[PDB]
Amino acid sequence: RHKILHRLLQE
Amino acid sequence: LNPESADLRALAKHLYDSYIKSFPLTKAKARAILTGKTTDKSPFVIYDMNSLMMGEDKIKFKHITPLQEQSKEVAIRIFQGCEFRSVEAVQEITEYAKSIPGFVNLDLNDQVTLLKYGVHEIIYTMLASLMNKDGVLISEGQGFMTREFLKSLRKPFGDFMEPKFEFAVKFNALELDDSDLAIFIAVIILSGDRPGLLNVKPIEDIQDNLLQALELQLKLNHPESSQLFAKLLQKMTDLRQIVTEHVQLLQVIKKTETDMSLHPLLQEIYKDLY
Numbered sequence: 001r002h003k004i005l006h007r008l009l010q011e
Numbered sequence: 012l013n014p015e016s017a018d019l020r021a022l023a024k025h026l027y028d029s030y031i032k033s034f035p036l037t038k039a040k041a042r043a044i045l046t047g048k049t050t051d052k053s054p055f056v057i058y059d060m061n062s063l064m065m066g067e068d069k070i071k072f073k074h075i076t077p078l079q080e081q082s083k084e085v086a087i088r089i090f091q092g093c094e095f096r097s098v099e100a101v102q103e104i105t106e107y108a109k110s111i112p113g114f115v116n117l118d119l120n121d122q123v124t125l126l127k128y129g130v131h132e133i134i135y136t137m138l139a140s141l142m143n144k145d146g147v148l149i150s151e152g153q154g155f156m157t158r159e160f161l162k163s164l165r166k167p168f169g170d171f172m173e174p175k176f177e178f179a180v181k182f183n184a185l186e187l188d189d190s191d192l193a194i195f196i197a198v199i200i201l202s203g204d205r206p207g208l209l210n211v212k213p214i215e216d217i218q219d220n221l222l223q224a225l226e227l228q229l230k231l232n233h234p235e236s237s238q239l240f241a242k243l244l245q246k247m248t249d250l251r252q253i254v255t256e257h258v259q260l261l262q263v264i265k266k267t268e269t270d271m272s273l274h275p276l277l278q279e280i281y282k283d284l285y
Contacts, residue, residue, distance in 0.1 A: 002123045002127065004275060005101075005123050005126055005127065005280070006119070006123060008101070008105040008126075009105060009108075009123065009126070010119075
């Protein structure tokens, strides 16, 4: 998983 | 001239406006600071231990994660500070990527993969804008840290920035402006040969269009410089060498300093990188 990158890309 | 090359102008203009919105410190502004031409910024010059301490007011060491790193010896604080600037770079690059036409329509797993392998190549590309042979602008151009000062840190921290300076003096010879770099970094992001890409085809489709735009941009903006396009693509491989070297040095640093920890965003990027 890449939780922070996922979060940066979804917000 | 023609409708095809007209679409490539619009794309170049779209990417330029997006780059301006995404990146506070542009190469235009950075060069103005380094040549002395009047600006907001008075960069405090850091050349030794004493100057760094007197310049702590102007550097935001306060924002480094985790906090225990903020109290450690100079070399670790400078390294962590540089790594922390990278964290803020990732956020700006991520926002820029989302503005590249077709990027947010890619498989989200592929968006993550492109950024994971792209960000440091883009970080060190754009860092060349903030560098001369004497030093590097830091803290959005409110600091100037000398090359010699970064060379002087104890091992294994002593030469962590030298490869970036050596890449920067060559790269800055191409005399690319912000408008050229805006397209070049989009080309780097949309690299179809990153490991573990699920669907390469729509990434190469987008990059092909970005590469054409970059080519047209370098013909129009530097019409007296003839093979600028060709020289620039050679550098995209010199960038990968810098990142592999940096990740290798980071592995050495993590294992020699066992109680150093990294920002979790950098842990997630560096994990299973080269």
